[PDB]
Write a protein that binds this DNA or RNA. Sequence first.
RNA 1: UUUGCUCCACACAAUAUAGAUGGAUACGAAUAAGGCGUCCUUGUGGCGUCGCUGAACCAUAGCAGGCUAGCGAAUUGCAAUGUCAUUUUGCGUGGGGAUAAAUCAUUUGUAUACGACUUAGA
RNA 2: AGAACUGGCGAUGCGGGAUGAACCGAACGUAGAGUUAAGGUGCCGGAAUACACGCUCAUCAGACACCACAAAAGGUGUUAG
RNA 3: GGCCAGCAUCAGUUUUGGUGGCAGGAUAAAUCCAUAGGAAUGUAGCUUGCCUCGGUAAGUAUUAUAGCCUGUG
Lengths: 197, 137, 172, 106, 189
Amino acid sequence: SQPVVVIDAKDHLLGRLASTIAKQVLNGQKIVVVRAEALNISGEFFRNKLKYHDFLRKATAFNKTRGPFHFRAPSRILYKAIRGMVSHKTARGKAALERLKIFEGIPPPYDKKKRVVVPQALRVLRLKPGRKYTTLGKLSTSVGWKYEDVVAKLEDKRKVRSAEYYAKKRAFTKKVSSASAAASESDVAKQLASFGY
Amino acid sequence: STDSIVKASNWRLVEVGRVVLIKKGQSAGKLAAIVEIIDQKKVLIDGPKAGVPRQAINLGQVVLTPLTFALPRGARTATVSKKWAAAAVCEKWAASSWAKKIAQRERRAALTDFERFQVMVLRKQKRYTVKKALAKA
Amino acid sequence: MAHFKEYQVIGRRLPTESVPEPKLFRMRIFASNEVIAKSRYWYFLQKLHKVKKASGEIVSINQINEAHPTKVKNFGVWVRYDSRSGTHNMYKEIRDVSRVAAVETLYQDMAARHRARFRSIHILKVAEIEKTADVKRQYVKQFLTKDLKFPLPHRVQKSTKTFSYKRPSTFY
Amino acid sequence: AESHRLYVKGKHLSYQRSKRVNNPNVSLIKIEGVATPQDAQFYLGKRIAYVYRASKEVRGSKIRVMWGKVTRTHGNSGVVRATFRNNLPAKTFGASVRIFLYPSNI
Amino acid sequence: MKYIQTEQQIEVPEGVTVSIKSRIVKVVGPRGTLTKNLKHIDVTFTKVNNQLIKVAVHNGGRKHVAALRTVKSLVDNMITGVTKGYKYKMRYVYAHFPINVNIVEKDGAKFIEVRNFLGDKKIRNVPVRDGVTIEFSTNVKDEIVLSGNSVEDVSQNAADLQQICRVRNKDIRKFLDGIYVSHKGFITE
RNA sequence: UUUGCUCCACACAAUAUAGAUGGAUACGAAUAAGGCGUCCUUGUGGCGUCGCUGAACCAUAGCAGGCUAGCGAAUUGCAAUGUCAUUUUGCGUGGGGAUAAAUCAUUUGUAUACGACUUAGA
RNA sequence: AGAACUGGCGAUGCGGGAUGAACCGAACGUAGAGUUAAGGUGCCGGAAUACACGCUCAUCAGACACCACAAAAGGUGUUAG
RNA sequence: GGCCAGCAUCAGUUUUGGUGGCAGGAUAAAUCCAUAGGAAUGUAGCUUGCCUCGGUAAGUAUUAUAGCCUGUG
């Protein structure tokens, strides 16, 4: 029921996350997918590389700028997957893609907000263990994406800030939980805990 | 020999006598006890004081609980109803924080509108003291 | 087809004046209802005796429940079936608690592993194995040892809401 | 207080349709917090309103309302059907409607 | 089908320490320290004792049970190269043209080079892998003894000299010139 | 030639909604594993505890939301938005603020089918 | 290319097979409600990311009869007899 | 005296819940009870070197300081 929903797309399967987003963004929900360089996709590596180099062959013969555009960034591979699952040649589908933004890494507008995770599209719930999967960052940088090292650099410049934030908030709840225990032996806590509270 | 350090897993493992929590179906939410292992997906249960019959339910519909009581494999309803009390299972179950929250989320759903109003006028008081217990910077 | 129910069916050639006491024939048939069971009687009987539905009658059809449906039993199943090229005879083993649950487990186990439908399977003999040396299939022998404890490593929590606000933990 | 709501904000999914054909008399409303057909039986008959904003003022109001009721449940997930008086304009696919509690049986 | 329980046992020798958390095996001992990462296997270790580690698996197939005994042997090769060590004796075979092997420390590290291999004019560089000391047998003029505390970085380096000293466009059964491995022994034996 | 224009302050009118009505409430890594607590020689360390859904947590007592420094709350008749939030754009009111270029015509040839390009000129 | 028996298209829309004269369902006054057929229910797309037991990892996997193809011959791939 | 709504009370068709009474079967089978035999994935006790009163090692021992099956009522 959040207006903007930020999805932590680490360890999500590509086509299963793209199907619970196309159905959600067609119902009027501004969905922001975030750190798509850590998306997963089943099958082993060179099998998925070969399913991409079959896609790179498909271009228009008479003028190759007409045909299918082979976008290489991991945000745009997931955006290729979502756009297949929306009727994007209409005004309903075009408006349903104006409610979707996808980035790789977590940008500064979205680092301070909560990130939610789709349970029916995670790798560790769907894929049977022992299967070989493929991280979308390593796949996309092998077909010509140039800014994997930048996104890995900027993400480490923000993981050390979010760890700095968590240590401040952990020490916050330490001095709150050590203080609220004196406010537990009251009568209102004896009055409220029978109410399921 | 010398010191050796290993930290892998300590699991709730399905064996004879383990208490399970029936989560799906006719006996929903009640406790049971595995009496005989059929195969790696299906088992045989019985809980008398919880009131369930002696089914042969598969493991996709039960949840394993962290407690166990000893009984031989393949015991009957007259046997499991004795060891359920001679090992004191149900009062051990209420002591866990799991069965506290199952009773808590049941109690929260059973309140009417008066004690949906009584909570907020008393949570105003519980909010009032924690700005006087944490009354600092 | 469906959730199986074991019937018995007694049948009889229709009498005539020369022989007004023909012999009764009994079959224990796993089928889904009273109508399919009476059809499977005149299938296996007509492959054994000179009698059709038109020439004979059905004496009695009853249902057979189990005396101990709360006890595991190492079942031993003899079964013939038509492959895509030829006919075979087999012997598997089932573990399940009820005789009709073993036949339900059998038809699933044969339609998966050999692609043999219901129409191309004739069961032969389903018998409880009384002591633990007649069990001769490895995949049943592991459940027949002392102190059978195994864990369930990879638990998944089936969700109701479509989003979650913490990374799920599979621990059991 | 800033507590004012007496409705439940459902979305307007689509018209009642098959593949390749749609029937604009019946619209499918996705109520929030409803996940089964049983407990979508609570909202049957309760009336919806699609409130929207127009530019030309009628009766001294810039907001116009389209009423209608909830008729029967749709398949297996708490979608319900609805029959509005004037049918919803199909520009509102993915637009918040408000299911009230007006004919009440609690 | 899926075997309900499959266990192996790793006997841990004396004075040898083993550290495992989340399928990363750090072994320290009387000579050397080895850290092998095993995240690609579904395997549960358990400390049943201080002298022997039980390694087990649950509900594994034929594929997965086969990949259990390869884990016990990989830990056993870790502790064996930590108690004793590993040494690979390699030997020069040449018909007429002598092979002249040295050790040079270039800009990066101890490259190994061979020269005059079958009269060739191109040097054949091959780096050492670290943890592997390089040794020449002084008494025998045509011998080289690799050695180290891991069997992997020695044998990959021992196969490196076999790969680089190959022949081209000739009968390999006639031109049997090269630098082959003959002995795979331990250090303290 | 204080008519131009820029910005900041209500008095406005006005147009436009792909669709606000409590709160988008922030570690990272791993899942055959972790969170939190707790001391300790500070570790791939002891010890406790927790998960099995966020149905949580935070907020929320009044005329569409008061007060004298305890009173105002009716008849909007039995339901009919029963409203009210924004994004813009012009016009008044006064508080400041800055004081230009481009194109055509003429020219140049590093350019040129025409446009374009590149140059020069108070 | 040619006959026998019926059914259909021609002369016929409709729901399904993405698409199609002939296949599956079913044949038509104009509307409302209800229930289904054939086919379907991750998303495009109305409808279970249902349930249950298995099998399968493919460096050209495989997925809706007519129908848009594949064979002898093989393989200590794995599973079952 | 008109249109348009809302609610009652009905009518026609229908959809979806709650709950009660019976009837049948091996007059359900089971469980539970009663009893008699039996065995093992062997309980007690007992017998062996270890040794934490047999524990863990196995030999007897068929309910004992757990129980299980099968027949019959």
